[PDB]
Amino acid sequence: KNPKSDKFKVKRFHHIEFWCGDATNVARRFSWGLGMRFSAKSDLSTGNMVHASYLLTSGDLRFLFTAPYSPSLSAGEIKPTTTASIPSFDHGSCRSFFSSHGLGVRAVAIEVEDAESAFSISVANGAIPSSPPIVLNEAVTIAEVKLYGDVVLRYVSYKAEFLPGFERVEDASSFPLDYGIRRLDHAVGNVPELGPALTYVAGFTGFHQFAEFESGLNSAVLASNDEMVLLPINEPVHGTKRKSQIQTYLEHNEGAGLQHLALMSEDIFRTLREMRKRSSIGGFDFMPSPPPTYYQNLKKRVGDVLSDDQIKECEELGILVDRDDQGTLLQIFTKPLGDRPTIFIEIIQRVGCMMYQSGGCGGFGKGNFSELFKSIEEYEK
Template identity: 55%
Template sequence: MGLDAPTLKLVGHGQFKRVNPKSDLFKVIKFHHVDWWCSDATSTQRRFGWGLGMQLVAKSDLSTGNTTFASYVLKSNDLVFSFTAPYSPNIEKSKESKCPVPWYKSDQALQFIASHGLGVRAVGVLVEDAADAHEKATANGAVSRLEPVTLKDEESETEQVVSEVLLYGDVVLRFVSGSYQGPYLAGYTAVASEPLSYGLQRLDHAVGNVHDLEKAVNYIAKITGFHEFAEFTAEDVGTVDSGLNSMVLASNNEVVLLPINEPTFGTRRKSQIQTFLEQNEGPGLQHLALKTDNIFATMRELRQRSSQGGFDFMPRASDAYYENLPAKVGDALTAEEYRQVKELGLLVDKDDQGVLLQIFTQPLSDRPTVFLEIIQRIGCMYERPGGGSAVPPVLEQAGGCGGFGKGNFSELFKSIEDYERTLDIN
């Protein structure tokens, strides 16, 4: 995909035909991490660690000689979150700060927090070559936010290359590559801790909200080569009160999925996407979908901690929704699984390939902006070839199996509308 790439147009779910042209401009492997910016990294990482079942694996703060910011890294299997907060830039430094990332600027972080509150600053993606990714992205119109920087890990004598381009709003797409195999970025100090996981496996998709959907999608597709994976219009997913338009971009391997939403207008209530754009003071990352292989076990853990410093979830769907589920989903779930779906307040949908189980948290902080989605995908298994006798074939699940909950959007919107009625924002 180059400068003359075809323009992507919103046509609606019914008219959209999925095709994977393998058009990535550079090799993309998977999500690497998500970097959250906040005003208090210590308290924030403790809440996420307790509420989601993620263990502290690395840090950079005053105890490691970093007088610029405090940053803590949490991990659950292949899911990695970092929480970074600036120290006061006005405090006189007695010595040079041992800051592991030379591009960090406290004044920029303070402005980000003032504008957005708790939010995602960087979506990290593991690529084959971060310098090459940056070069090709900027050659195709990407706005550079960080020229390639080489970080060195003295203990392992390995290196890591990091670069960034603008994604949308104040969010950057961060490319990561190199020989360093640590839990996050080279230069952070590893932390020994007891293994902890409630079953969250990895980041499935990262969703952004923007003012102009087609403009944002075409920018991202042009700078990455990502192809369109799915799309939905207000007619597909809205209620009589509000709606949205959405398009999903995917890497060649369809492991990195980037849905983008825009608000629609002319309904009785303001679209929740418009509410986000107002409360976030512009485009930004709306939610992260965290994948588990056993949503029943994971949600029992998360529900148990909801009232103990964890996260609150959107209200359960109506009884009629659960009564109609077997007719919609069929025998993909057992009677016992249907019972647990209702008990835990999950939503269920399916496409022509698989089944999706999902549930959404309420907003994570003071503003009705960023939230989390917990999902499980069922079906779409295929055998990835191995590397001869030494590396046997591996059974894997195709990316995006079961879709993105199109059949649940109306029920979800009603839940969000009910929640927003409790807030003085419309």
């Protein structure tokens, strides 16, 4: 059931912004590890005396990495005279965010029809304002409201190239890396209490609950009208046998924040081959692979979707597989992206639900919690 109750017109995920200590080093690491190309910049070389911001792209996926310069460079500026390209940026907020949470997502940005309207409607419906609508070069409007913890939901709308004030990157500095990642599928928050988090976000967006089907969590998913913007939220389940990874997150993150970004690949086999080649030479590591029993058990569960060779390819790469009543999900998880056991990345590809492919086809892999557990125990004996 999809009541299509969005209170404003939402299009697609637009970009994800990381707040960093040094944007250069994070962006270069992510570019190599994920196969994303350097696409735009806003920094000292473009006249920005406030923050350094670097944009990586792969297909429609946009990762933005931002860090503050010394406030002394912009001491004489005021907001009306700012050289910042992102008017919501604040030195003190950025440093406090990073000192509190470490490296992580500050902004989940969605493209909307009218960011000014989306902001007004959201706040009228309970959203806590974070940054009011600002029109950039009469061309792009940006606004922000609080999502959870210190993460904001950023609205962007275009009259009609990332943002005014950003420059396209020189061809020589823009190596065309591509491991097959194409868009952001979903962005997941960890909170202490799921109930109030859902009520708050669903309250100001009109996003509806997306239908699902001792893991340490309870979860629910909020979706836009066409279910292409997908925002799952988790809370811990306490007293468990093994300590909840949601609770570990909240402790090391100093509270609620973004837990994982799921990146859709047009060819998850090639993406995982390319990322795993680079794990130990600057890229990303992956969670330990499931035992062979997990892949033996794949034949009975998805043998009508994947050949034995394609299942064997899943086993080589450590890929997990889950299935809905509608579609099939191939997924895998990186180890944490930085120092803290907080944010990580999921790579996914979805099979089925053709009409284009409908959003969330195959679910989010929650069935893999028990299938992993079963496969571990079976492999022991």
